[PDB]
Amino acid sequence: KFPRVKNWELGSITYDTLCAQSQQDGPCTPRRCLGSLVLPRKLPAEQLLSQARDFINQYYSSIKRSGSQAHEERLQEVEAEVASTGTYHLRESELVFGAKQAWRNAPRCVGRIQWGKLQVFDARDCSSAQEMFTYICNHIKYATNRGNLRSAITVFPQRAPGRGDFRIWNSQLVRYAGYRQQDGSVRGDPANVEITELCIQHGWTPGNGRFDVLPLLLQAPDEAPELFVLPPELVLEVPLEHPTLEWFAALGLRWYALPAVSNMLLEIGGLEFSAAPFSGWYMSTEIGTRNLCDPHRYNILEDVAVCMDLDTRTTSSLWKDKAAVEINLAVLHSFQLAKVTIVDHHAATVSFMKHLDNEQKARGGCPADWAWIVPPISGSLTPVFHQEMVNYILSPAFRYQPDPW
Amino acid sequence: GPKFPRVKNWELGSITYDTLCAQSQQDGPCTPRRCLGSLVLPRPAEQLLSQARDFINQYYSSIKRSGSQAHEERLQEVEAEVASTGTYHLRESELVFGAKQAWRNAPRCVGRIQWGKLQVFDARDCSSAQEMFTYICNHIKYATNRGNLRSAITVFPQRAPGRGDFRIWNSQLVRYAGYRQQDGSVRGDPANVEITELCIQHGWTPGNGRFDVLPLLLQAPDEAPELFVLPPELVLEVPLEHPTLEWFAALGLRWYALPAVSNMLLEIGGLEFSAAPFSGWYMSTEIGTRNLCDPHRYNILEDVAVCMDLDTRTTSSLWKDKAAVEINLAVLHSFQLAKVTIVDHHAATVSFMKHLDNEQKARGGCPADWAWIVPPISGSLTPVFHQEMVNYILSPAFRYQPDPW
Numbered sequence: 041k042f043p044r045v046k047n048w049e050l051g052s053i054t055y056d057t058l059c060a061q062s063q064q065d066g067p068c069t070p071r072r073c074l075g076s077l078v079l080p081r082k083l084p085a086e087q088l089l090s091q092a093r094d095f096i097n098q099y100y101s102s103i104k105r106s107g108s109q110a111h112e113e114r115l116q117e118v119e120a121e122v123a124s125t126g127t128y129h130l131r132e133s134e135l136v137f138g139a140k141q142a143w144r145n146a147p148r149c150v151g152r153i154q155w156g157k158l159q160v161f162d163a164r165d166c167s168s169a170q171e172m173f174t175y176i177c178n179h180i181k182y183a184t185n186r187g188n189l190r191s192a193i194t195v196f197p198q199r200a201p202g203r204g205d206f207r208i209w210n211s212q213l214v215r216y217a218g219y220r221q222q223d224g225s226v227r228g229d230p231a232n233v234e235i236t237e238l239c240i241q242h243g244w245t246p247g248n249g250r251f252d253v254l255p256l257l258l259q260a261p262d263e264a265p266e267l268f269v270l271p272p273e274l275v276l277e278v279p280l281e282h283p284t285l286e287w288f289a290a291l292g293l294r295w296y297a298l299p300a301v302s303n304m305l306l307e308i309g310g311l312e313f314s315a316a317p318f319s320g321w322y323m324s325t326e327i328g329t330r331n332l333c334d335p336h337r338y339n340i341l342e343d344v345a346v347c348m349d350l351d352t353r354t355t356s357s358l359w360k361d362k363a364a365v366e367i368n369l370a371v372l373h374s375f376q377l378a379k380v381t382i383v384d385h386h387a388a389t390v391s392f393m394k395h396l397d398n399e400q401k402a403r404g405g406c407p408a409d410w411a412w413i414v415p416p417i418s419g420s421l422t423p424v425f426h427q428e429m430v431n432y433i434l435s436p437a438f439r440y441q442p443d444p445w
Numbered sequence: 446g447p448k449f450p451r452v453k454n455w456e457l458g459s460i461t462y463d464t465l466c467a468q469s470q471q472d473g474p475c476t477p478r479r480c481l482g483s484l485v486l487p488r489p490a491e492q493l494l495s496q497a498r499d500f501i502n503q504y505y506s507s508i509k510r511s512g513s514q515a516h517e518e519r520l521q522e523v524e525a526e527v528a529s530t531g532t533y534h535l536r537e538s539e540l541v542f543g544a545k546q547a548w549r550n551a552p553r554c555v556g557r558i559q560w561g562k563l564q565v566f567d568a569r570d571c572s573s574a575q576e577m578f579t580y581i582c583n584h585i586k587y588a589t590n591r592g593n594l595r596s597a598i599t600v601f602p603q604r605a606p607g608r609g610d611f612r613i614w615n616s617q618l619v620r621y622a623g624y625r626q627q628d629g630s631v632r633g634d635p636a637n638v639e640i641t642e643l644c645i646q647h648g649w650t651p652g653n654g655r656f657d658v659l660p661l662l663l664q665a666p667d668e669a670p671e672l673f674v675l676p677p678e679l680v681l682e683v684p685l686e687h688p689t690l691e692w693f694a695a696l697g698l699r700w701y702a703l704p705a706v707s708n709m710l711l712e713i714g715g716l717e718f719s720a721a722p723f724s725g726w727y728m729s730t731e732i733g734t735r736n737l738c739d740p741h742r743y744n745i746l747e748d749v750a751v752c753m754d755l756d757t758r759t760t761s762s763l764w765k766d767k768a769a770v771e772i773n774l775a776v777l778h779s780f781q782l783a784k785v786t787i788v789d790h791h792a793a794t795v796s797f798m799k800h801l802d803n804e805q806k807a808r809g810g811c812p813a814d815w816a817w818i819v820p821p822i823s824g825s826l827t828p829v830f831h832q833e834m835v836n837y838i839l840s841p842a843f844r845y846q847p848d849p850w
């Protein structure tokens with residue numbers, strides 16, 4: 041049965057028929073819904089061959105060459121290669137198509153209106169951690185573009201049965217160190233305590249600030265990972281100030297321009313790319329709300345509230361809500377002043393609604409994870425709060441994978 | 446680990462396993478292939494007896510007499526009563542237990558810390574629409590308690606074979622009229638256009654303000670509903686003012702004190718109580734964010750932002766977030782001044798976390814609907830945002846039921 045999908049603000053209804061193309065189970069069953077879980081609990085040639093075929097058909101259908109001689113030959117090549125070797129390789133154009141499709145298919149991404157605009161760097165001819173680093177630098181340079189951010193993905197060599205994976209150990213290309221204190225607390229970003237320690241242990245001389253950019257740990261197959269410091273000119277950062285509260289800059293806050301996820305696996309036609317870092321630009325609440333105000337992150341709400349002279353003694357003064365708004369405002373203002381691409385949560389969710397509509401017409405649905413699409417402040421002030429969403433796994437897909445240590 | 450859903454709190458790093466979901470006898474709308482968790486409404490003989498037996502088992506467990514002679518005799522009583530009449534009836538203490546458990550079971554309610562403290566009015570002797578009105582007036586008086594609100598449910602006679610249902614047509618005991626205008630817009634609450642026009646069709650002389658309290662449409666078995674005006678002195682309202690924005694009072698906004706849901710079905714041991722209105726006290730975001738700021742409700746955000754002199758021509762000023770905060774603050778401040786019970790979304794979610802811990806120890810889990818539990822402003826500023834939740838249906842339950850017309 042196909043799900044009826046209602047928008048509660050507009051009263052309009054659609055039917056999701058795309059979910060029928062799902063070949064992979066999510067975490068839910070009729071007995072209990074596990075939609076709010078962040079990670080999956082659970083984290084032969086004929087099965088590879090059927091994923092490969094399905095993906096090749098997706099590709100030829102996308103270039104409107106479905107059933108062509110080019111199409112049939114390509115399927116025979118894939119078939120001949122799997123049968124002899126247990127695996128196959130993608131053509132660059134297939135890889136490019138596959139990577140845009142994985143982004144398109146990502147249920148947690150609110151930025152999917154952009155999905156067709158993705159620079160794909162083919163790095164499958166990489167043979168060493170040293171080469172990975174060079175590719176990573178070029179990616180950063182290209183994606184940053186002096187503040188005019190451009191979406192990009194770099195795809196390192198696929199996993200192969202006989203050997204270790206290419207991996208970037210860091211969860212993002214740009215991350216701030218978190219230094220555990222003898223007295224339990226953390227200096228820097230508490231989310232990065234473990235990777236910070238791994239870096240030091242692999243030879244990095246640590247800093248002692250709140251915002252020390254981490255080096256990269258890059259791993260070529262079956263080798264210890266190697267440490268690479270990113271050249272500071274590569275990492276564009278925006279100092280945070282507020283349009284009207286002058287003390288705000290005194291807080292010494294800053295964030296980096298480029299959000300670039302580097303720990304996720306890219307799956308295309310049954311092939312798996314364990315190192316395929318991708319990047320776009322930030323939505324302001326990621327920084328203003330989560331990274332700065334989460335209690336297990338920089339946790340600056342109290343500091344800001346004290347500075348704004350708010351009554352911190354009672355929740356009902358809504359001091360938290362008031363401080364968060366100003367912090368988000370500071371992020372938006374500072375990124376705009378520095379001329380660095382950023383989108384606020386109102387503009388982002390409005391674009392996502394238009395994306396849902398485009399996708400309804402093009403594919404008969406759009407997989408979306410409501411808990412992730414709705415922003416972490418002002419939920420119901422955005423149109424996506426009132427929109428029902430169906431969540432399911434299509435391939436090509438970005439997936440979580442185990443930490444390599 | 447254990448073969449039960451693993452539930453993580455991402456703020457604290459702590460893990461639990463939900464074993465209570467095992468007690469679910471009723472399927473939700475999710476499958477392995479697609480999650481329908483964000484959908485607001487997803488679409489007897491031996492059947493009764495097994496629901497009855499299971500409920501009677503729950504009752505005897507809760508008073509610690511499982512397997513006792515009194516437990517076995519009640520079981521026998523129930524099957525005999527069904528055997529000869531097709532239905533059965535609850536003892537008074539069974540009803541009280543079942544009503545409390547219905548509330549304890551409600552996955553969408555953030556106020557369940559209070560579940561044990563529920564006044565159950567037994568109105569199973571009611572035989573007319575006039576008497577329903579008297580009971581409902583008594584309920585409102587008791588629950589309102591001049592501003593010191595008290596949780597209550599009033600239970601009218603159950604569905605019976607052949608015979609028509611007791612129904613309250615209104616969705617809440619207190620609702621404001623919504624009058625469709627010539628220009629196509631609505632004066633009052635647009636959520637209530639249909640019930641308003643039904644009240645007129647049944648002979649109510651309509652008012653024409655933004656905050657006209659609706660009469661009740663009450664239906665006794667096999668009769669047309671009858672119209673009842675609530676005496677104005679029984680309906681406590683709170684005029685809205687802001688602690689520092691002196692003009693806010695001039696907007697003439699107000700809300701009623703008592704949230705009293707009247708169109709839900711209370712199901713206990715297979716028995717169906719089609720009229721069983723229940724009330725608590727408000728969480729401030731229900732009024733300040735949803736009822737006043739939803740685009741399809743009072744939709745006041747822009748009017749307030751304009752009075753605050755915000756830049757409403759650009760999303761990136763965060764005018765909507767700033768205005769919503771002040772409206773929420775005005776709600777809290779005004780209820781506080783008026784001495785009417787209300788709870789802010791920070792205190793409420795903190796108490797819900799406490800509830801989750803109580804229920805983990807008491808029953809090994811707690812069914813909870815994340816999208817409904819997380820408040821509509823300041824989501825990740827509250828501890829429930831960082832808490833994974835397992836949603837499933839337990840009985841006794843409050844359930845949606847079709848409109849009687």
Ligand code: HEM
Pocket residue numbers: 139143146148149150151152154158191192193318319320321322323326383388412438
């Ligand atoms: C162009 C601007 C983009 C914006 C504004 C954006 C926005 C977002 C946001 C806000 C999230 C949730 C992040 C979080 O809370 O941690 C997200 C998740 C994600 N986005 Fe994007 N996105 C963009 C581009 C991209 C690109 C280029 C890709 C890949 C090609 C991508 C794939 C993803 C994936 C896979 C996730 C899920 C991450 C996870 O499950 O942990 N997005 N997006």
Ligand code: HEM
Pocket residue numbers: 544548551553554555556557559563596597598723724725726727728731788793817843
């Ligand atoms: C004591 C104070 C209470 C508070 C603060 C409270 C809070 C809430 C809130 C905020 C919601 C979601 C409302 C919405 O967005 O529409 C809700 C839903 C609900 N609560 Fe409560 N609650 C309280 C008492 C009660 C009582 C006394 C009962 C019944 C005995 C109850 C049963 C429910 C049910 C069944 C729902 C779900 C309704 C639906 O699905 O539409 N709650 N609660």
Ligand SMILES: Cc1cc(N)nc(COC[C@@H](CN)OCc2cc(C)cc(N)n2)c1
Pocket residue numbers: 078079299300301318319320321322323326
């Ligand atoms: C490409 C992109 C653009 C943009 N604006 N934002 C992002 C967000 O990146 C952070 C995402 C990437 N997995 O992190 C989500 C996450 C996942 C997990 C398992 C844990 C955690 N703390 N956070 C990515």
Ligand SMILES: Cc1cc(N)nc(COC[C@@H](CN)OCc2cc(C)cc(N)n2)c1
Pocket residue numbers: 556616636704705706723724725726727728731
């Ligand atoms: C008892 C109680 C306490 C409290 N603080 N809040 C509530 C609010 O309940 C409103 C619920 C009623 N099912 O809202 C869901 C709903 C129902 C209807 C008919 C329309 C609508 N838009 N939304 C109820």
Ligand SMILES: C[C@H](O)[C@H](O)[C@H]1CNc2nc(N)[nH]c(=O)c2N1
Pocket residue numbers: 075076077078411412413455830831832833834
């Ligand atoms: C438990 C809950 O699912 C978890 O906190 C999720 C909620 N929604 C989110 N949404 C986004 N965009 N990013 C997140 O990290 C989360 N965290």
Ligand SMILES: C[C@H](O)[C@H](O)[C@H]1CNc2nc(N)[nH]c(=O)c2N1
Pocket residue numbers: 048425426427428429483484485816817818
């Ligand atoms: C589409 C979505 O399910 C819908 O807007 C829900 C989201 N969460 C909610 N949460 C509560 N408490 N009340 C609501 O009415 C809603 N609406």
Ligand SMILES: [Zn+2]
Pocket residue numbers: 068072073074075475479480481482
């Ligand atoms: Zn689900």
